Amino acid sequence: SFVEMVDNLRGKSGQGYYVEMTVGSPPQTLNILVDTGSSNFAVGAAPHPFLHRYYQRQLSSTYRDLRKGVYVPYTQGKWEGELGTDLVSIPHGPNVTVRANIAAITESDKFFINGSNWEGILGLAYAEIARPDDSLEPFFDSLVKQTHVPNLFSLQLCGAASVGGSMIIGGIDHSLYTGSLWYTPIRREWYYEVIIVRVEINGQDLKMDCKEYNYDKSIVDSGTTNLRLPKKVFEAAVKSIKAASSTEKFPDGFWLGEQLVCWQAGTTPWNIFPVISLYLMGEVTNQSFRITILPQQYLRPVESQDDCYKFAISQSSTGTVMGAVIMEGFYVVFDRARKRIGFAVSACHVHDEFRTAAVEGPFVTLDMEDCGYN
Numbered sequence: 001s002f003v004e005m006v007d008n009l010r011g012k013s014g015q016g017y018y019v020e021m022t023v024g025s026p027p028q029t030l031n032i033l034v035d036t037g038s039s040n041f042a043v044g045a046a047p048h049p050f051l052h053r054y055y056q057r058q059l060s061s062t063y064r065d066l067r068k069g070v071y072v073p074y075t076q077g078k079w080e081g082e083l084g085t086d087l088v089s090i091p092h093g094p095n096v097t098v099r100a101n102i103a104a105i106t107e108s109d110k111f112f113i114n115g116s117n118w119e120g121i122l123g124l125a126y127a128e129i130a131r132p133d134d135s136l137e138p139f140f141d142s143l144v145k146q147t148h149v150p151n152l153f154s155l156q157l158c159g160a161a162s163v164g165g166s167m168i169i170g171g172i173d174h175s176l177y178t179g180s181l182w183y184t185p186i187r188r189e190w191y192y193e194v195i196i197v198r199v200e201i202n203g204q205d206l207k208m209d210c211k212e213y214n215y216d217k218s219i220v221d222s223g224t225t226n227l228r229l230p231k232k233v234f235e236a237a238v239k240s241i242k243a244a245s246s247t248e249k250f251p252d253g254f255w256l257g258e259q260l261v262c263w264q265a266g267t268t269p270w271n272i273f274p275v276i277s278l279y280l281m282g283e284v285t286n287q288s289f290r291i292t293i294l295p296q297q298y299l300r301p302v303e304s305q306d307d308c309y310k311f312a313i314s315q316s317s318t319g320t321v322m323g324a325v326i327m328e329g330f331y332v333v334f335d336r337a338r339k340r341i342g343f344a345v346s347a348c349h350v351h352d353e354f355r356t357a358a359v360e361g362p363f364v365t366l367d368m369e370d371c372g373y374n
């Protein structure tokens, strides 16, 4: 289908998947972190110790200055920059060129990560969470308006010694998944917000009130490594995961994500660790489906003679974040036109001979609308 875009993502393990883009005329080439959990297109536009290249506005004949500052504080870090527009391309994407808003980052703190090899961020979420407000049109919105690129993109993030993946823009490559695509509704267009209606650890129901799972929201976020869970849910989950994997004991530096666990060679005993399943609201009334990941997703290799891992499930005060530990099991279709998100078993996901990630349905589920926090 879209062979031109397959494998257009790279990254360093635990640093973020970026795509190559060009900004300006003549085109200045940059690496840009793909982030479905934000909605500003912002790039380094002044020297920084962790930047090697950066957007030089004065060298672009198509640069237009909006003459307005943007200040973006995160939990951390933060940056500030200057709003402007310019022509923008994605070389291993659709062969088009669009004019888009760009926040030129001129000062930052604890934002740019050394070794990450990305010089900017492409926020693919919606205008409502854009800075400085929702009147600043996000990149993907501009792309779709100025082109015949359909209003949909799909990400395959691979485990899988450098990470790789594909961002297919405007459609769905059937070679990137197996089995069926199952769709959950986007509850509201800001984050890519979804509703989780059941959680299992090795088939055992976490057995919480379902709105705990989405307190105060659940989102699909390529800009986050971990599966992050609301405090209550997180405690119930690690307790369950601890019980399930009890044949082996681990320092609780481990369950906090501080400490590593290690094993010889390919001696990692995947089978003692439980699978984790989230049920997502389906497109049909009282119908859900479930996605299931392996320890190969939630145990992240840290790079000898031994294999070592960090525990990548962690707690959150801002609701569920389905970051890369989730996404790396699946081909994820962000179907903006139909206001829904699709998941299929990923053709590149890491697993062993006996287990694989799963997408399965349907399951009869009642009162699913009630699982959403207001």
Ligand SMILES: CN1CC(N)=N[C@](C)(c2cccc(NC(=O)c3ccc(Cl)cn3)c2)C1=O
Binding pocket: 014, 015, 016, 017, 035, 036, 037, 038, 074, 075, 076, 111, 113, 221, 222, 223, 224, 225, 324
């Ligand atoms: C809290 N938050 C989350 C999010 N989605 N977006 C940003 C704006 C953000 C800022 C800077 C870096 C990153 N991501 C990473 O560095 C990253 C992403 C994915 C992996 Cl697999 C690894 N690293 C995200 C945020 O502030």
